Design a binder for this molecule. Structure first.
Ligand code: EU3
Ligand code: EU3
Ligand code: EU3
Ligand code: EU3
Length: 104
């Protein structure tokens, strides 16, 4: 994967997260600031998603831990756990808002 393609895939990922938040009607605020996509919940907690172009990775920061994802198999995959990014994100959103956003 080159830089231009990573950009395409990551842009699609960010729009999908934003779109699915819209489909869901969930009370999750989103703001993209450059490479960052910040999700804020009504309890003032946050999930921060960051693009790292030179590594062709997407990074997620939860309240406890950081996670780094590769595009594998048409999906974004955690490089330690093998967990898929969007399944994991749905669960994190749920833990912090108890609202439900499906990205599948
Ligand atoms: Eu190529
Ligand atoms: Eu709206
Ligand atoms: Eu609000
Ligand atoms: Eu903005």
């Amino acid at each position: 994967m080159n830089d231009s393609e990573f950009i395409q895939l990551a842009d699609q990922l960010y729009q999908k997260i934003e779109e699915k938040i819209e489909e869901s009607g969930a009370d999750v605020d989103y703001d993209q600031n450059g490479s960052l996509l910040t999700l804020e919940f009504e309890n003032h907690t946050k999930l921060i998603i960051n693009r790292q172009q030179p590594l062709h990775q997407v990074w997620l920061a939860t309240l406890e831990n950081g996670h780094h994802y590769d595009y594998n198999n048409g999906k974004w995959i955690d490089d330690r756990s093998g967990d898929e990014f969007l399944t994991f994100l749905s669960a994190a959103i749920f833990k912090q808002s108890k609202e439900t956003v499906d990205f599948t």
